[PDB]
Write an enzyme that holds these catalytic residues in place. Structure first.
Site, PDB file in Angstrom:
ATOM      1  N   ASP A 180      28.024  49.584  34.549  1.00  0.00           N
ATOM      2  CA  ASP A 180      28.102  48.858  33.286  1.00  0.00           C
ATOM      3  C   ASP A 180      29.026  49.545  32.297  1.00  0.00           C
ATOM      4  O   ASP A 180      29.725  48.864  31.534  1.00  0.00           O
ATOM      5  CB  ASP A 180      26.704  48.708  32.696  1.00  0.00           C
ATOM      6  CG  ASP A 180      25.770  47.995  33.647  1.00  0.00           C
ATOM      7  OD1 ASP A 180      26.069  46.839  34.021  1.00  0.00           O
ATOM      8  OD2 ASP A 180      24.788  48.623  34.071  1.00  0.00           O
ATOM      9  N   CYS A 214      39.287  40.687  37.949  1.00  0.00           N
ATOM     10  CA  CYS A 214      38.090  41.205  37.315  1.00  0.00           C
ATOM     11  C   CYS A 214      37.854  40.223  36.184  1.00  0.00           C
ATOM     12  O   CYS A 214      38.038  39.020  36.387  1.00  0.00           O
ATOM     13  CB  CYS A 214      38.267  42.662  36.865  1.00  0.00           C
ATOM     14  SG  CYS A 214      39.830  43.071  36.110  1.00  0.00           S
ATOM     15  N   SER A 215      37.483  40.679  34.996  1.00  0.00           N
ATOM     16  CA  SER A 215      37.381  39.711  33.910  1.00  0.00           C
ATOM     17  C   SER A 215      38.754  39.377  33.336  1.00  0.00           C
ATOM     18  O   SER A 215      39.146  38.200  33.287  1.00  0.00           O
ATOM     19  CB  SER A 215      36.453  40.217  32.799  1.00  0.00           C
ATOM     20  OG  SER A 215      36.257  39.172  31.865  1.00  0.00           O
ATOM     21  N   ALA A 216      39.521  40.394  32.927  1.00  0.00           N
ATOM     22  CA  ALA A 216      40.867  40.105  32.426  1.00  0.00           C
ATOM     23  C   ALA A 216      41.961  40.220  33.484  1.00  0.00           C
ATOM     24  O   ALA A 216      43.108  39.839  33.209  1.00  0.00           O
ATOM     25  CB  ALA A 216      41.199  41.026  31.252  1.00  0.00           C
ATOM     26  N   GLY A 217      41.650  40.727  34.679  1.00  0.00           N
ATOM     27  CA  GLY A 217      42.676  40.917  35.693  1.00  0.00           C
ATOM     28  C   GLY A 217      43.627  42.066  35.438  1.00  0.00           C
ATOM     29  O   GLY A 217      44.756  42.036  35.953  1.00  0.00           O
ATOM     30  N   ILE A 218      43.202  43.100  34.702  1.00  0.00           N
ATOM     31  CA  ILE A 218      44.108  44.231  34.452  1.00  0.00           C
ATOM     32  C   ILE A 218      43.445  45.597  34.620  1.00  0.00           C
ATOM     33  O   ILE A 218      44.113  46.550  35.032  1.00  0.00           O
ATOM     34  CB  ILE A 218      44.753  44.141  33.053  1.00  0.00           C
ATOM     35  CG1 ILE A 218      43.720  44.220  31.921  1.00  0.00           C
ATOM     36  CG2 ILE A 218      45.650  42.887  32.954  1.00  0.00           C
ATOM     37  CD1 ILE A 218      44.350  44.283  30.508  1.00  0.00           C
ATOM     38  N   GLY A 219      42.163  45.728  34.265  1.00  0.00           N
ATOM     39  CA  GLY A 219      41.542  47.052  34.309  1.00  0.00           C
ATOM     40  C   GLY A 219      41.035  47.460  35.678  1.00  0.00           C
ATOM     41  O   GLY A 219      41.690  48.252  36.378  1.00  0.00           O
ATOM     42  N   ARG A 220      39.892  46.893  36.096  1.00  0.00           N
ATOM     43  CA  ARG A 220      39.424  47.139  37.455  1.00  0.00           C
ATOM     44  C   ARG A 220      40.420  46.633  38.482  1.00  0.00           C
ATOM     45  O   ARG A 220      40.695  47.315  39.478  1.00  0.00           O
ATOM     46  CB  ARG A 220      38.049  46.510  37.665  1.00  0.00           C
ATOM     47  CG  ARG A 220      36.973  47.147  36.826  1.00  0.00           C
ATOM     48  CD  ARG A 220      35.694  46.283  36.913  1.00  0.00           C
ATOM     49  NE  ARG A 220      34.788  46.584  35.836  1.00  0.00           N
ATOM     50  CZ  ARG A 220      33.600  46.010  35.698  1.00  0.00           C
ATOM     51  NH1 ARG A 220      33.212  45.104  36.589  1.00  0.00           N
ATOM     52  NH2 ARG A 220      32.807  46.351  34.684  1.00  0.00           N
ATOM     53  N   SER A 221      41.028  45.470  38.226  1.00  0.00           N
ATOM     54  CA  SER A 221      42.028  44.941  39.145  1.00  0.00           C
ATOM     55  C   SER A 221      43.185  45.914  39.314  1.00  0.00           C
ATOM     56  O   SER A 221      43.708  46.091  40.424  1.00  0.00           O
ATOM     57  CB  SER A 221      42.554  43.598  38.612  1.00  0.00           C
ATOM     58  OG  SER A 221      41.540  42.632  38.756  1.00  0.00           O
ATOM     59  N   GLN A 261      42.927  50.143  31.985  1.00  0.00           N
ATOM     60  CA  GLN A 261      42.584  49.872  30.594  1.00  0.00           C
ATOM     61  C   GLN A 261      42.015  51.073  29.846  1.00  0.00           C
ATOM     62  O   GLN A 261      41.840  50.976  28.627  1.00  0.00           O
ATOM     63  CB  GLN A 261      41.606  48.682  30.533  1.00  0.00           C
ATOM     64  CG  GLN A 261      42.394  47.373  30.593  1.00  0.00           C
ATOM     65  CD  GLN A 261      43.186  47.161  29.303  1.00  0.00           C
ATOM     66  OE1 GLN A 261      42.613  46.749  28.291  1.00  0.00           O
ATOM     67  NE2 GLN A 261      44.497  47.477  29.317  1.00  0.00           N
TER      68      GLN A 261
HETATM   69  O1  LIG Z   1      36.766  43.613  34.006  1.00  0.00           O
HETATM   70  C1  LIG Z   1      37.893  44.208  33.699  1.00  0.00           C
HETATM   71  O2  LIG Z   1      38.114  45.401  34.153  1.00  0.00           O
HETATM   72  C2  LIG Z   1      39.025  43.810  32.711  1.00  0.00           C
HETATM   73  O3  LIG Z   1      40.284  43.709  33.044  1.00  0.00           O
HETATM   74  N1  LIG Z   1      38.537  43.682  31.382  1.00  0.00           N
HETATM   75  C3  LIG Z   1      39.151  43.460  30.106  1.00  0.00           C
HETATM   76  S1  LIG Z   1      40.573  43.843  29.602  1.00  0.00           S
HETATM   77  C4  LIG Z   1      40.632  43.379  28.107  1.00  0.00           C
HETATM   78  C5  LIG Z   1      39.365  42.855  27.736  1.00  0.00           C
HETATM   79  C6  LIG Z   1      38.434  42.942  28.997  1.00  0.00           C
HETATM   80  C7  LIG Z   1      36.950  42.479  29.044  1.00  0.00           C
HETATM   81  O4  LIG Z   1      36.355  42.482  30.192  1.00  0.00           O
HETATM   82  O5  LIG Z   1      36.336  42.160  27.980  1.00  0.00           O
HETATM   83  C8  LIG Z   1      39.101  42.361  26.367  1.00  0.00           C
HETATM   84  C9  LIG Z   1      40.262  42.111  25.482  1.00  0.00           C
HETATM   85  N2  LIG Z   1      41.355  43.070  25.665  1.00  0.00           N
HETATM   86  C10 LIG Z   1      41.705  43.415  27.024  1.00  0.00           C
HETATM   87 CL   LIG Z   2      47.505  49.034  27.759  1.00  0.00          CL
END
Ligand SMILES: O=C(O)C(=O)Nc1sc2c(c1C(=O)O)CCNC2
Ligand SMILES: [Cl-]
Ligand SMILES: [Cl-]
Ligand SMILES: [Cl-]
Ligand SMILES: [Cl-]
Length: 279
Positions: A180, A214-221, A261
């Protein structure tokens, strides 16, 4: 070597500084299409958009826009599509993209709900007998079976183009245990998951790029594709310690903004690559 560079960064506590250097050096390219007024409801996060040059374009006679990017790693000879978790109004677009791009696998790195909040639409059927029809893009999606393990689930999905009645088997690789907060303490489960996706053939050049979200497609992805590409580079090069994870991440960020991220996600990527290279 990279294992020693990791230790030096840990000792000096400079993960935040290195990560901020990446953010400062990251490419900036236009996202005109993503920011058009008509696409307001196709973007989950207003601050996460695909660059025009790498965005995935839908083929049907409607708005061609989906929040999805083609990442093409030339030296590693691997491609990925990175996309946001689909919205209730973009699940048809998501499966149209899978169909049109000839993908064999979808990698999901989030739960639909996390810490009590909704991060992604329920874009696949949970029950065999309750298939999903996407009337806008003329696709039918059926759950055929699922193999639920303690930390990930692999689903056999059947995607049917209702226009031609052609069907395809899509493999759904769902990592269900990302913590989490923060990153996994150990990369063991994440690497086992990556290896399962690899063994499926879903990342091979034979069909279209895997779809990763993932949710935004940038962090976990971003962590998933970065680890995978860096491990490929380490197998290919004569001096595998010459793989510069920061350079590789900046190359990937030419194709989609914001990959990785947080500083913890950067450290986790290093740790995953170090452990996976050992095998
Ligand atoms: O699940 C993820 O790793 C992912 O890319 N998450 C991201 S990146 C990102 C957000 C989130 C979110 O989940 O709220 C919120 C707004 N800014 C960028
Ligand atoms: Cl960034
Ligand atoms: Cl518009
Ligand atoms: Cl879920
Ligand atoms: Cl949603």
């Amino acid at each position: 070597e990279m294992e020693k560079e990791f230790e030096q960064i840990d000792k000096s506590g400079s993960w935040a500084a290195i990560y901020q250097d990446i953010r400062h050096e990251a490419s900036d390219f236009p996202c005109r299409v993503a920011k058009l007024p008509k696409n307001k409801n196709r973007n989950r996060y207003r601050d996460v958009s695909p660059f025009d040059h790498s965005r995935i374009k839908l083929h049907q006679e409607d708005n061609d826009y989906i929040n999805a990017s083609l990442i093409k790693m030339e030296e590693a000879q691997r491609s990925y599509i990175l996309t946001q978790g689909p919205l209730p109004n973009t699940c048809g677009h998501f499966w149209e993209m899978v169909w049109e791009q000839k993908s064999r696998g979808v990698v999901m790195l989030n739960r639909v709900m996390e810490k009590g909040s909704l991060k992604c639409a329920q874009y696949w059927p949970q029950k065999e007998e309750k298939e999903m029809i996407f009337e806008d893009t003329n696709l039918k999606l059926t759950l055929i079976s699922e193999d639920i393990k303690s930390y990930y689930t692999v689903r056999q999905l059947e995607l049917e183009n209702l226009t031609t009645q052609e069907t395809r088997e899509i493999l759904h690789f769902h990592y269900t245990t990302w913590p989490d907060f923060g990153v996994p303490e150990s990369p063991a489960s994440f690497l086992n998951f990556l290896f399962k996706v690899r063994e499926s053939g879903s990342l091979s050049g034979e069909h279209g790029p895997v779809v990763v979200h993932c949710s935004a497609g940038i962090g976990r992805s971003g962590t998933f594709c970065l680890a995978d590409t860096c491990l490929l580079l380490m197998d290919k090069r004569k001096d595998p310690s010459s793989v510069d994870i920061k350079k590789v991440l900046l190359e990937m960020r030419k194709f989609r903004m914001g990959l990785i991220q947080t500083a913890d996600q950067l450290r986790f990527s290093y740790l995953a690559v170090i452990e996976g290279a050992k095998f």
